[PDB]
C-alpha cells in the first residue's frame, strides 16, 4: 500500500531474464536492476527472492508469491507454504480420545440481493433532443427488452430476499425474563434503545457498510434507482421472529408450531444429537455457557476492530456502482464522430450530413448500455445462485441441526443464529470442537469365556492395567458389562482380540 | 402489453417529463461590424508571402451578405455547413486573402499536396473553416502579363501550417515566378481571388456572433436556453461556484456543460435538467 | 490514436478478464486446500489388509504423485498454453506453424496458475493420509489416531450394520477393496475417453 | 467490428466461468462432506451405502 511504503517490483509476465534488459515505457530502472529472478510466469526485477516458507501475501504465479518484510525493509520473493507438517501417530492398537471440548461460535456472511436499477433509454442515449428521439425508433425494440430484462432482475432481487428471510409463518417473541438457561443472549436479541429495532451485532454489521454527489449525477442520466419491497425494519423483525422462536422452540417451530421447552434440556438434545450424551452438559453447563458467552463477546471485539470481513457485501456495494459510473462516463466518448455533444452536431451541421455523425453515438451509446444489461444479468444470476444457499443454510441449521460435514462451520453443529445485514446475511455458527487428546490402547473385541464381546456404542479402551468402555467423543471410563456390550460367535475369528472379564450385575444380584 | 386484455399487476408504461415553457436566447450585445468589406472588396490583393492574415474580432458577422451576391465561385467549408454559420458564435475568425492561377486552387486544401499547397502553406487536418474563392479577371489580368504577383516553385523543406517564412535566394535556379496575369488565356490560366476563413472553436469568451437577438432571463423555471449557440432545455439557477476569471464553462463527469456564464452580466449559472420519472400502472 | 476516442471499452474488458482470472484461483483453493496441517503416512504401510499403495504418493517420481494420479494426467492432453512457452525461438521461425505463437503474436496470452500441480498433489496426499490414519476427526479439531480396521468397523456401524460383520470378514473385504482398486486402474489404463469433462 | 468480436469472447467466457464456479463449488462440497466425513444423502457420493 502507498500508505505503508513506495517500494515497487516489476513482473514482466512471459519474457525470459536475458531478453528485457528500444522500450515503450519510458522509465527503465525496473528493467537493468540487480534483483533479477526468474519465474515461469516471467521476470521479476525489484524483488530479493528468498528461500523460506511463508503464506502467500501477493500472488504472483506459479508458487511463487510476494510480500514487504523487513529483511531494512524491502519487497522479499518467495514460494509459497501450503501449511505446517504433520505426522499422525498411527498403530495398530493406538487411539487418541478427546478428555475436553471447546464451543466456537463462527461467523459466515453471504449476500442475498442487489440494488434494483432502471435505465431510461431515451434520456440517457439522446438527452432532451427531438430529432433524435425521432430517429431512435428506427432501431426496432432494443429498448423493450432491455427494460424487460432490468424489471426482470429488479422483481427476482425481491424473491431473493422474500425467499431467504420470510421463512417463519408468526413472528415470535421472547418472554421478558431473559434468564435462557444461563447463555447470554443480548448481543442477538433486539434492542428498543434504537428507532429501527436491531441488535448490537445488526448495528455493527449496519455500520461496517459504507452503503450510498454521484447520486444526483447519475439521476440527471436517467439511471434510477428503485427502493427494495422489504424495508431493513421489516428485515430485522423476520431475524428478531426467526431469533425468538430458535431460542424458545428448538427446531420444533421449523415442523410445525412452536414448542415449548427449557435451552439447557434442548442444548443437551443438541449434544444428544452427535454422539455426546446428555449428561455431559448437565454436569458442564456453567463451563458451556461461559464458553458461549466468551465467544459471543469475541465476535464482537473482531466485528468493533475489523471491518475487512464483510468484503463480500461490500462488493455488491461497490459492482453496483462503479457499472454505473462507467456508464455515465461513456456518454463523453465520440464513437469517431466530430462531438459528444448532440445538440453541437444539429448546431453545425445540417440534416443531410449530420445524421451520420449522430447515428455512430447513437450505436456506440446502445452498444454500451447492452454491455451493462447483460453484465447485470450475469450478476444477478451469481447473487441468486448466493441467495438460494443462503435460504438452504437457514433452513437446515437455523430450522434444525445439520448433520452435513463444514456445511454450517468448522466441527460438530450445534446451533446458528441469523442476522441481517446490507444486501445480506451473516450466520452465527455454534459449533462443538473436541480440545485435549489423550493416549489409549484400544482392541476391537474382549474374550470372556470363549465368546467375543464387541462394545454396543463406544471404544474399548485400555489405561495400562484395566479395561473401559468409553464414548467416541469425549472420554468416560466405566466398567465392562454384558448391558453395554453385545456377544457374537467365538474368539478364533476377530484379529486383534483380548482376553478381560465381563462383569455381571446379575450375580451380585443372587448373593443378596 | 399490445393486449386488449391487462391481468392484475403493475406495469411499468412510460415516462413523464416536465416540458419547457420559454425559450431564452443570450448573447453578448456587440453591435459593430466585420471588416468583410476591407476583405473582398480589397482594390488590391497580396501575394502568398504577405499572406493578408486579417483578425476579425467584436463583430455581428452576417454571411448572408456572401449570400446575396451572385458572383462567387466556390464556398466549400469544413466542420460547419455554410448555411448554419448565422446560427453560430466564434472567438477569432482569421481571413486569408490571396491571388492564385484555377489550376493551383484546387492544391490548397488540408492533407492535398502540390507545389504551392506544400512549398507556402498548409492547412491541417483538424481545419474547421470555409474557402471561398472567385474568378476575378476584370482586375487581377493585366495587358501583356500581370508582373507584381511572385509565388514559390521550389522549396527544400516542407513547411508547417499558418507559416510566414519568406526567403528570396536562389536555391540548389531563381525558385520564384511570376504567372504574368492575361485576360487572354484559359479558363484553368485565370486568376482567382480566394480568401479562407478558419475560426477557433474554443471555450472561451467568443466574440464574433451572429445576428441573434438576445433577450431576458428566466430563473428557476424549465426554460430552452441559447448561450452564444450552446442549445438546450432545463433550470437555470443561481450558483455559487468560484469561477476563476478565464473560465467560461462549468463540465460534469460525462463532459457535459452543467454551469454557464452569461455573455452580458458576469454572474454563474447553474444548469439543472427538468423533472423527470417514469410512470407505473397500478391496476387490477 | 483513432482508437483513444472509443472509450473505456478495453479497462472494462480487462476487469473482467483479471475477475475471471482471480476467480479460478479462489475456486482451485476453496477444493483443495481444505486441509489445515500437511499430513503424512507412517513408514510403515500395513492398514488392516487394506492396499493403499496406488493412491498414496510414490517417491520414486519426480512429481510426487500417485499411480492413479500419473494415469489421470497422462489421459487429458493438455496444451502448453505458452506460459511453458515463454522462450524467445517462439519469435524465431522454428519448428512449423504453432497456434500458441500465432495467438502470442495476437496479443492472446495465458497465465499460469497460482497453484503448481507438485502442490495440489501434497494437498491430496495429505487429506488421503488424514483419511487413513484419522477418519473423520482431522474434519472437526485435530487428528485422533484409529486403527484402520476399527475404523472401517465404524463405517459399517454409520450405514445400519453391526460392525461383527467385518470383524468376522475383514479378509474378505479387503480383498474384494483390492480387487476394485485394480479395476479401477485396468480401466483407467484401458479407456482414455473417461476424463472427457476435464477434455 | 474487433471489438464486437473481443466482447463476445469476454461474454462467453463469463458465462463459462460460473458454470466453472457452480462445478467447483459442487466440488468443493463433495470434498467437505465425503471424503472429510460419511454422507446419508443417498446418491451423492457413488451408488449404495457410502
Ligand atoms: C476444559 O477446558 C476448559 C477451558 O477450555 C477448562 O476451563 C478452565 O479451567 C481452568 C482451570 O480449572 C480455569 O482457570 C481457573 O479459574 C479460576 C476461576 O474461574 C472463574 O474465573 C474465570 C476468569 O478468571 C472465568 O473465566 C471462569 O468461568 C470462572 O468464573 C481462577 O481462580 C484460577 O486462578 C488460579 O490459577 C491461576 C493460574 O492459572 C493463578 O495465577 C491464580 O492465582 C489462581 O491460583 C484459574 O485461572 C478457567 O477459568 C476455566 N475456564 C472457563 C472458561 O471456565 C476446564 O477446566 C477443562 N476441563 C478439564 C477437565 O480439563
Ligand atoms: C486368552 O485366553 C485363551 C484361552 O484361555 C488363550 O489361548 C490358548 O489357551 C490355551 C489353554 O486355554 C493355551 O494352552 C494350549 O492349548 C492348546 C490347545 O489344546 C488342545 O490340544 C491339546 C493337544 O495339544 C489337547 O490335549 C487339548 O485337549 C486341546 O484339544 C495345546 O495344544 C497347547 O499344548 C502345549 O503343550 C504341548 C505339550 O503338552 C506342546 O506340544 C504344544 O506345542 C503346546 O505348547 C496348550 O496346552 C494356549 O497356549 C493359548 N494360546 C496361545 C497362543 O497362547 C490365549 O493365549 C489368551 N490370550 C493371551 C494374550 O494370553
Ligand atoms: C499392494 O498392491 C501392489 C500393487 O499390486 C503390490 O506391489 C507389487 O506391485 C508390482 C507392480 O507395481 C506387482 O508386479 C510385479 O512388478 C515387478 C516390477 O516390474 C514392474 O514395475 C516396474 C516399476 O517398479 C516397471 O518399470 C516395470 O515395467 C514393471 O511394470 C515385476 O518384476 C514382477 O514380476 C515378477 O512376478 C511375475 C508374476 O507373474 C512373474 O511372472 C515374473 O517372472 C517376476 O517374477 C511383478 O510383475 C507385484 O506383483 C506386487 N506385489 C505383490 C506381492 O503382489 C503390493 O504387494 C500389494 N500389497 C499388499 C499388502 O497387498
Ligand atoms: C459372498 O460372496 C463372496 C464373493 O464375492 C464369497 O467369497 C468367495 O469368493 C471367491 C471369489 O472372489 C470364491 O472363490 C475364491 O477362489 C480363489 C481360487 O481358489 C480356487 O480353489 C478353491 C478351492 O478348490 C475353489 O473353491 C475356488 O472356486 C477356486 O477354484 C481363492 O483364492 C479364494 O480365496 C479368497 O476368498 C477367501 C474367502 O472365501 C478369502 O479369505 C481369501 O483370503 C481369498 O481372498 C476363494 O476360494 C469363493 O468360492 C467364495 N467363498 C465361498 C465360501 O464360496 C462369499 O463366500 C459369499 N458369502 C456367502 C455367505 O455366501
Ligand atoms: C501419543 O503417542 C504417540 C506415540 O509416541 C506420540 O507421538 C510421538 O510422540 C513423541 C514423544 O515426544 C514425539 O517426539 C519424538 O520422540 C521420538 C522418540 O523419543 C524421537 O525419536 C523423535 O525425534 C521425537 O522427538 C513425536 O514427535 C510424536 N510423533 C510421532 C509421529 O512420532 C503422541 O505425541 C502422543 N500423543 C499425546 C497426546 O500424548
Ligand atoms: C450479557 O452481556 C452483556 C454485554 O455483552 C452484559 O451487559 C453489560 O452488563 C454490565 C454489568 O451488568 C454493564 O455495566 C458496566 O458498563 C460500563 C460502561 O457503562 C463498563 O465499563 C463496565 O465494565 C460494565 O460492563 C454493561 O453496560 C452492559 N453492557 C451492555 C452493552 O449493556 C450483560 O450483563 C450480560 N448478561 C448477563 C446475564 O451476564
Ligand atoms: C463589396 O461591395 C459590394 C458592392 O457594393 C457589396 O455588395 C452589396 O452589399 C449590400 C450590403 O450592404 C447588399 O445588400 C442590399 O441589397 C438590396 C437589394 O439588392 C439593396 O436594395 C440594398 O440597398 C443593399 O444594397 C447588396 O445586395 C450587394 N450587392 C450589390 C450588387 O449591391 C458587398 O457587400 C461588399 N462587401 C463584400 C464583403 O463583398
Ligand atoms: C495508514 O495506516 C495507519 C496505521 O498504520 C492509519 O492510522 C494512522 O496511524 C498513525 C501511526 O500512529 C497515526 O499517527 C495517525 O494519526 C493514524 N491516522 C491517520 C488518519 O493517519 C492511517 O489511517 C492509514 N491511512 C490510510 C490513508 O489508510
Ligand atoms: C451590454 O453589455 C454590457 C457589458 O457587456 C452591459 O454593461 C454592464 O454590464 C455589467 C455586467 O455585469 C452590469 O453589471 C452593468 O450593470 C452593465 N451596465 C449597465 C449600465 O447596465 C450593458 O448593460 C449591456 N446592455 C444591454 C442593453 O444589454
Ligand atoms: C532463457 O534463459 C535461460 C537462462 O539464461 C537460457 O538458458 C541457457 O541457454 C543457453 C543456450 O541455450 C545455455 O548455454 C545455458 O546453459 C542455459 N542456462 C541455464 C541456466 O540453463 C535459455 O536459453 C533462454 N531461452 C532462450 C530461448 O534463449
Ligand atoms: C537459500 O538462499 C541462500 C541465500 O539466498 C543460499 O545461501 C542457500 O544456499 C539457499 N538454499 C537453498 C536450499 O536453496
Ligand atoms: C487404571 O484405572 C483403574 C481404575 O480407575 C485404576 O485402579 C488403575 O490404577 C489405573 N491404572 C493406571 C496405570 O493408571
Ligand atoms: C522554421 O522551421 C524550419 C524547419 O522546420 C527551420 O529550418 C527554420 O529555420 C524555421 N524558421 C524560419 C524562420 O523559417
Ligand atoms: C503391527 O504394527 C507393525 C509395525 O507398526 C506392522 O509391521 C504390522 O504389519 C502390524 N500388524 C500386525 C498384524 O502385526
Not at chain 1, 418 to 428: K, N, R, T, Y
Not at chain 1, 447 to 467: I, L, M, Q, Y
Not at chain 2, 44 to 60: D, G, M, P, T
Not at chain 2, 78 to 83: A, D, H, I, N
Amino acid at each position: 500500500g502507498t500508505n505503508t511504503s513506495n517500494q515497487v517490483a516489476v513482473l514482466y509476465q512471459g519474457v525470459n531474464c536475458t531478453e528485457v534488459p528500444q522500450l515503450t515505457p519510458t522509465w527503465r530502472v525496473y528493467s537493468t536492476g540487480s534483483n533479477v529472478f526468474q519465474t515461469r510466469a516471467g521476470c521479476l526485477i525489484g524483488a530479493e527472492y528468498v528461500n523460506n516458507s511463508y503464506e502467500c501475501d501477493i500472488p504472483i504465479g506459479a508458487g511463487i508469491c510476494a510480500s514487504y518484510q523487513t529483511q531494512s525493509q524491502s519487497i522479499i520473493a518467495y514460494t509459497m507454504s501450503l501449511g505446517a507438517e504433520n505426522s499422525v501417530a498411527y498403530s495398530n492398537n493406538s487411539i487418541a480420545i478427546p478428555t475436553n471440548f471447546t464451543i466456537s461460535v463462527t461467523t459466515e456472511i453471504l449476500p442475498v440481493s442487489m440494488t434494483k436499477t432502471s435505465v431510461d433509454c431515451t434520456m440517457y442515449i439522446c438527452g432532451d433532443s427531438t430529432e433524435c428521439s425521432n430517429l431512435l425508433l428506427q432501431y426496432g425494440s432494443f429498448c423493450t427488452q432491455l427494460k424487460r430484462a432490468l424489471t426482470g432482475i429488479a422483481v427476482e432481487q425481491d424473491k431473493n430476499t422474500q425467499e431467504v428471510f420470510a421463512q417463519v409463518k408468526q413472528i415470535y417473541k421472547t418472554p421478558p425474563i431473559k434468564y435462557f438457561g444461563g447463555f447470554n443472549f443480548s448481543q442477538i436479541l433486539p434492542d428498543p434503545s434504537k428507532p429501527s429495532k436491531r441488535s448490537f451485532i445488526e448495528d455493527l454489521l449496519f455500520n461496517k457498510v459504507t452503503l450510498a454527489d454521484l447520486i444526483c449525477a447519475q439521476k440527471f442520466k436517467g439511471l434510477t434507482v428503485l427502493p427494495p419491497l422489504l424495508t431493513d425494519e421489516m428485515i430485522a423483525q423476520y431475524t428478531s421472529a426467526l431469533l425468538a422462536g430458535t431460542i424458545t422452540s428448538g427446531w420444533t417451530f421449523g415442523a410445525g408450531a412452536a414448542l415449548q421447552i427449557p435451552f439447557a434440556m434442548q442444548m443437551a438434545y443438541r449434544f444428544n444429537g452427535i454422539g455426546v450424551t446428555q449428561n455431559v452438559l448437565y454436569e458442564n453447563q456453567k463451563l458451556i455457557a461461559n464458553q458461549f458467552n466468551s465467544a459471543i463477546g469475541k465476535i464482537q471485539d473482531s466485528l468493533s476492530s475489523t471491518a475487512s470481513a464483510l468484503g463480500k457485501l461490500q462488493d455488491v456495494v461497490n459492482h453496483n456502482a462503479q457499472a454505473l459510473n462507467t456508464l455515465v462516463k461513456q456518454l463523453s466518448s465520440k464513437f469517431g464522430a466530430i462531438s459528444s455533444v448532440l445538440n453541437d452536431i444539429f448546431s453545425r451541421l445540417d440534416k443531410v450530413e449530420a445524421e451520420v455523425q449522430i447515428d455512430r453515438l447513437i450505436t456506440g451509446r446502445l452498444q454500451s448500455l447492452q454491455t451493462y444489461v447483460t453484465q447485470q444479468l450475469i450478476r444477478a444470476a451469481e447473487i441468486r445462485a448466493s441467495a438460494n444457499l443462503a435460504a438452504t443454510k437457514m433452513s437446515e441449521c437455523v430450522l434444525g441441526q445439520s448433520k452435513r460435514v463444514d456445511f454450517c462451520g468448522k466441527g460438530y453443529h450445534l446451533m446458528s443464529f441469523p442476522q441481517s445485514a446490507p444486501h445480506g446475511v451473516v450466520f452465527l455458527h455454534v459449533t462443538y470442537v473436541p480440545a485435549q487428546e489423550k493416549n489409549f490402547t484400544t482392541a476391537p473385541a474382549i474374550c470372556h469365556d470363549g465368546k467375543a464381546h464387541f462394545p454396543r456404542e463406544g471404544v474399548f479402551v485400555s489405561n495400562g492395567t484395566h479395561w473401559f468402555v468409553t464414548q467416541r467423543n469425549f472420554y468416560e471410563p466405566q466398567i465392562i458389562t454384558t448391558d453395554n456390550t453385545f456377544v457374537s460367535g467365538n474368539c478364533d475369528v476377530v484379529i486383534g482380540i483380548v482376553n478381560n472379564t465381563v462383569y455381571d450385575p446379575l450375580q451380585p444380584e443372587l448373593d443378596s | 402489453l399490445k393486449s386488449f386484455t391487462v391481468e392484475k399487476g403493475i406495469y411499468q408504461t412510460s415516462n413523464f417529463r416536465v416540458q419547457p415553457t420559454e425559450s431564452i436566447v443570450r448573447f453578448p450585445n456587440i453591435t459593430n461590424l466585420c471588416p468583410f468589406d476591407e476583405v473582398f472588396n480589397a482594390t488590391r490583393f497580396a501575394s502568398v508571402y504577405a499572406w493578408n492574415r486579417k483578425r476579425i474580432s467584436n463583430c455581428v458577422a452576417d454571411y448572408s451578405v456572401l449570400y446575396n451576391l451572385a458572383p462567387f465561385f466556390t464556398f466549400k467549408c469544413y466542420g460547419v455547413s455554410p448555411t448554419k454559420l448565422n446560427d453560430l458564435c466564434f472567438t477569432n475568425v482569421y481571413a486569408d486573402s490571396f491571388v492564385i492561377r484555377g489550376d493551383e486552387v484546387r492544391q490548397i486544401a488540408p492533407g492535398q499536396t502540390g507545389n504551392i499547397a506544400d512549398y507556402n502553406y498548409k492547412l491541417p487536418d483538424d481545419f474547421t473553416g470555409c474557402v471561398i474563392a472567385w474568378n476575378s479577371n476584370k482586375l487581377d489580368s493585366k495587358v501583356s502579363g500581370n508582373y507584381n504577383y511572385l509565388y514559390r516553385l521550389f522549396r527544400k523543406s516542407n513547411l508547417k501550417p499558418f507559416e510566414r517564412d519568406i526567403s528570396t535566394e536562389i536555391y540548389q535556379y531563381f525558385p520564384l515566378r511570376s504567372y504574368s496575369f492575361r485576360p487572354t488565356y484559359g479558363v484553368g490560366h485565370q486568376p482567382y481571388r480566394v480568401v479562407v476563413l478558419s475560426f477557433e472553436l474554443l471555450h472561451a469568451p467568443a466574440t464574433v456572433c451572429g445576428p441573434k437577438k438576445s433577450t431576458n432571463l428566466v430563473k428557476n423555471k424549465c426554460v430552452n436556453f441559447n448561450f452564444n449557440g450552446l442549445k438546450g432545455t432545463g433550470v437555470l439557477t443561481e450558483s455559487n461556484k468560484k469561477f476563476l476569471p478565464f473560465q467560461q464553462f462549468g463540465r460534469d463527469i460525462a463532459d457535459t456543460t452543467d454551469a454557464v456564464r452569461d455573455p452580458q452580466t458576469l454572474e454563474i449559472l447553474d444548469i439543472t435538467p427538468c423533472s423527470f420519472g417514469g410512470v407505473s400502472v397500478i391496476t387490477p | 490514436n483513432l482508437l483513444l476516442q472509443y472509450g473505456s471499452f478495453c479497462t472494462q474488458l480487462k476487469r473482467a478478464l483479471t475477475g475471471i482470472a482471480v476467480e479460478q484461483d479462489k475456486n482451485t483453493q476453496e477444493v483443495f486446500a481444505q486441509v489445515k496441517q500437511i499430513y503424512k503416512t507412517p513408514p510403515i504401510k500395513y492398514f488392516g489388509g487394506f492396499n493403499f499403495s496406488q493412491i498414496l504418493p510414490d517417491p520414486s517420481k519426480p512429481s510426487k504423485r500417485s499411480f492413479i494420479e500419473d494415469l489421470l494426467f497422462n489421459k487429458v492432453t493438455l496444451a502448453d498454453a505458452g506460459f511453458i512457452k515463454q522462450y524467445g525461438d517462439c519469435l524465431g521461425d522454428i519448428a512449423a506453424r504453432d497456434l500458441i505463437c500465432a495467438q502470442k503474436f495476437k496479443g492472446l496470452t495465458v497465465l499460469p496458475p497460482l497453484l503448481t500441480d507438485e502442490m495440489i498433489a501434497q494437498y491430496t496426499s495429505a487429506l488421503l493420509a488424514g483419511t487413513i490414519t484419522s477418519g473423520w476427526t482431522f474434519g472437526a479439531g485435530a487428528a485422533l489416531q484409529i486403527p484402520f480396521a476399527m475404523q472401517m468397523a465404524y463405517r459399517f456401524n454409520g450405514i445400519g450394520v453391526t460392525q461383527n460383520v467385518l470383524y468376522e470378514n475383514q479378509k474378505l473385504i479387503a480383498n474384494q477393496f483390492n480387487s476394485a482398486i485394480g479395476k479401477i486402474q485396468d480401466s483407467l489404463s484401458s479407456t482414455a475417453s473417461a476424463l472427457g469433462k476435464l477434455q
